[PDB]
């Protein structure tokens, strides 16, 4: 199928396995903003839902189902791959809605469903919007939909805005300069340091911050969910032309999404930007490997490459320069093993 | 091969790409108790690595085999599966130990050695000290041992002793009853509160607590690594039977583990139980999803089974009775994914 | 077919009753000097309500509020008492010399026979969240006595209800139930009545005191004016309410207190129980959720707090409470009859 | 109609059923260790006394008595309650896979039907001083279903006396009613009434637990062998005693408590609610002198502790005592059935 040749047999038995627990559907289903925003959008868009077909698409526990059914929808379909599948059919048994919903255990790309949908729900966004590749199971479900109907999340934006932050900068080498030493218990360990600084370097950072990190507005990539095709999440080129509104060295680009429902009667913004309330996405930071002094007013241009990788993550090439002095830097990430900081 | 026969493949590669990290080496090593332990085990009694032929099982960056040159060692194979084994060979170069250290990339169940060995030395030990499944890699290497020869670290005890922390209880109670709500956004979840609770409770948790909250001495179960065959480490049975010494109620079993190095001039222990200062194993407790309710005086008396599984870990069945009232606490863990609270 | 006897319980009237003919009850009634204190100011300080008047004392106990109406100068005062306590404020009448002005009528002020009508009535009706022992019904029956031109003391009634936060207390709550989730209690498993025993537990109001910091919302007011009201108002009361959160967190249920004024000819006196003013025996009292609910600042709790008398002289409370935002809902039934005295 | 009824107050049985039909009520009995551990024991430890026998339990509660019975490997149990805390019995003979061996019955023991005879009765129907609730009469009329052959569990009880010196506790009574003895409480003399509030307190047997180097003389006691006891025998219960005093003091009244044994055929097992013993929620029960007795070591103080049993399902109490050597004399009335819990 679709999903199998895009993801090794070993990153997707451990995928499904982290998503068979209740306690991370607990984790994302008690962070308000993500549950709030959701039902908020859903219901405050009844008649995109009243007498409707609807499919969820990796429904987990069903908890989106459920809200299009308060909305007034006819029948829902909530595909579900993970063992959570036998939880959402109990939910559905409990809370007496066998007759409008129906869980299909499997794959959106390999299950089978019998007729077209009105509207497609769904919340596959991960880190820095694209992590986990569930959005292409989420615009794949787009053959199940008809010609005028429409998705929930409707679009999505990822930022990315420049940072300077020497204390994490810093910590890189504080920590890789544990192998600097010529007698470790006898040892010289030196020869491994600058491996060391390498394998720190490549994991982008998840943890969140203070906003006077950031040195320039940031830039916006949009997914029109409705117009794009799942082809087009394998090569993500982000380019960027920042202006640069403080003076200082810049460390690296920090990245967060914002998703738009748009509806019939409103559009509704579910947004993990460090200017609102924190969500269990946190943000993103990658540092570039050698920082860029740049001057308010200045310009760093460059491009932000995501290449989709068979581990259900990508790999960040980042290339930035400082037009108006040349300097430049880059650095190449790996998604799939980030290093969670928050404390 | 021994190994893959016993391990998901998918199991494997999370495995040992985790071992493949400098990041983690640096964890181990800084472990100054784990170290240190090793470094004197090993240096005081270096009569039994003089000019002798050495077998060092998951080497890792490769600190053991260094310590084994140090203590004046003709040879040493160090076996790695993960790409550790390429940075462990970098440093045998940069510390001038070519002639000595000779790293093999690979199993210890597929690669071939030149030659028998005197002595074998690693260090196995997970979490609960079968975590990982490590020990029997470290039994079957004993098909290159020498007749007579030594292993280091020579024997294993697990302790387990029952405990009363009704934080902790009521920690992992209130994380199930969030499935508890009839209505969570309108939605009743309760149907799942028994689904939950299951699943909170097969967490061992990983972090360490005050003796007090023991209610009696632990029971010490041995593992003989000179005599024990992997095939032993399938299905381990503990019996046990305490004499409580407090009143109360038990929460569950507190697990820890000392092994000792039994060499010619001396015994040198490494133990992570509380009494002793803290190691990054810490220690493990397998809560009851409900306590009993015990008198000093009484007999808590079950059995700890530990069934190993294709995931390179163990599935845990405890059932224990107070033996004066009848009352019976049955339970299932999975120690593979523990609940790390420290 | 006293109005009393016909809404009712005879065994728990006799209870009730007996639990009042102790003078060591009457002591601990009389030493609560927020609520002795405030109704002597309240009859001294509205003296031209009572001086040369005919004064109606329903459930006087020991008589200590006839007292203070003849302080103020009453003609007259009639003293009603069910209880044998009855007997103890004759005695105190003659030992305090005022046969000629305080006369003691025992019975039930539902079936007793006064003499005259009466220009004012006193009495303490207010139990535990105000309507606990539906005496508040015998003092409006009481209003057939009363002359066109008569006033009462106190006056009228405020109740008050706000969402609160106290997760030590749903927790204590929580955990006794808990009990009955064992599967092996000396080999027996319990686990089948865990449902039952919530239930029963969660039936329970709490009484006691508490910091006004665990509060969310402004409180919501009901107010009963005795002058006014009928005794069958009293019978189904219906309180609804519509809270605007202030702060976030788990809403855990709902307090409630209450304040009486008495409204006079020359000032209002008023007697409160909330937690911003010091404490009486009356403390306040909490009403648990079986399931706390979440919500956010600037969301709104609106529902219905309904209350239906019940024939052992108490009410049963249903308390039905929903986040509009979100439609997370909560109902709740409790027994004001038998409280948890948490307050030792 | 009944024997119950007969004897019972409709007020004070109303009341009764409704106290044992809450689950917390339950809770408190079976966590009660001594309590619940001794019955287990005694019922297993004579397991030949069980196996394969014909069990009536009488006042089964939550049914934890049958489930031991069963555990011993009773053949047929039937556990009879009246309260509706037999709903919850049933559930829980349901949820444990007994409904084949464990039958309950719905109901007063006096009032049902049981299908036939049976081995052995066991119940646990002591209260306060053992008699209060006056359920050892239940006890007895249930040996109408007992064979010839058949054993009671627990099969003797014995209440024991001994006299006691507690200044702080005589005094005590006095502090409390002197709240009366004042001339002008907020205006009124209340002094007229000191005399009831003393007398109020001291007819008020004292429940909780001493130090036993307050007791002056080693115990009388007084048995009851639930084999050969009939019902009647407990309307009029006569305890006479000797005591020989130990040490040199004033007396201040008799504590009571009681033990029971199982008489099993395989051995004796003793529940024992003494000061000597750890503590049961039963505690110790005091009952003072309205005035205290002067007695020398050796002097000898004589009397009678006469219980008799009233519709309110408890005693009214008459202790008479003198010192032989001096004449002095003195005495109470209590009434067991309204203790003052003074346990902190
Ligand atoms: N926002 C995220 N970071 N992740 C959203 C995961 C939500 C649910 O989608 C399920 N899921 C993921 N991929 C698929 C798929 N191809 N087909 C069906 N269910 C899926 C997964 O098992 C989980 O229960
Ligand atoms: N103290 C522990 N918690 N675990 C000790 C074993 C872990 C180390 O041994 C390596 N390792 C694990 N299994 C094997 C094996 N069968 N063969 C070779 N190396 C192995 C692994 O890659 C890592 O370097
Ligand atoms: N403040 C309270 N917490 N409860 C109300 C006052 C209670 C007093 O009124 C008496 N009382 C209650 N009901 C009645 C009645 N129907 N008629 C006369 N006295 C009564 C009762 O005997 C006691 O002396
Ligand atoms: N140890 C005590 N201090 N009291 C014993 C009461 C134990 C149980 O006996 C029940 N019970 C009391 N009297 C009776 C009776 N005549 N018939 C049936 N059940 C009864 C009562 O409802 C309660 O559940």
Same mark, same amino acid.
């Given at each position: ?78 595909? %579900? ?18 007759? #409008? ?8 790309? %390999? ?11 769904? %919340? ?8 986990? #590749? ?36 810093? %910590? ?62 394998? #090569? ?48 993103? #930071? ?58």
């Amino acid at each position: 199928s679709v999903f199998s040749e895009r993801t090794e047999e070993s990153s997707a038995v451990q995928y499904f396995q982290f998503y068979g627990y209740l306690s991370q559907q607990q984790n994302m289903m008690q962070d308000y903003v993500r549950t709030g925003t959701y039902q908020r959008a859903i219901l405050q868009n009844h008649t995109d839902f009243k007498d409707k077909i609807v499919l969820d698409v990796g429904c987990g526990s069903g908890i989106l189902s459920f809200f299009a059914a308060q909305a007034g929808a006819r029948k829902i379909y909530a595909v %579900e791959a993970s063992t959570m599948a036998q939880h959402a059919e109990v939910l559905v048994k409990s809370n007496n809605l066998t007759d #409008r919903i129906v869980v299909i255990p499997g794959k959106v790309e %390999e299950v089978s469903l019998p007729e077209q949908v009105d509207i497609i729900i769904s %919340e596959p966004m991960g880190y820095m919007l694209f992590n986990e #590749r569930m959005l292409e199971s989420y615009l794949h479900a787009k053959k199940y939909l008809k010609p005028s109907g429409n998705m929930f999340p409707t679009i999505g934006d990822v930022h990315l805005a420049p940072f300077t932050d020497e204390q994490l900068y810093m %910590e890189q080498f504080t920590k890789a300069n544990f192998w600097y030493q010529p007698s470790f218990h006898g040892v010289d360990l030196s020869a491994l340091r600058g491996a060391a600084v390498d394998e720190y370097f490549r994991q982008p950072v998840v943890d969140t911050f203070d906003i006077r990190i950031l040195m320039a507005k940031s830039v916006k990539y949009t997914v029109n969910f409705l117009e794009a095709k799942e082809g087009d999440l394998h #090569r993500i080129e982000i380019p960027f032309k920042f202006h640069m509104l403080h003076s200082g060295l810049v460390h690296g680009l920090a990245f967060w999404f914002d998703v738009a429902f748009i509806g019939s009667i409103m559009t509704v913004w579910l947004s993990t930007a460090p200017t609102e309330p924190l969500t269990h996405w946190y943000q993103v #930071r990658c540092l570039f490997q050698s920082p860029l002094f740049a001057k308010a007013g200045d310009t760093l241009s460059g491009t932000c490459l995501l290449i989709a990788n068979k581990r259900q993550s990508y790999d960040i090439s980042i290339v930035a320069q400082v037009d108006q002095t040349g300097s430049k830097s880059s650095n190449l990430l790996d998604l799939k093993n980030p290093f969670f900081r928050y404390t």
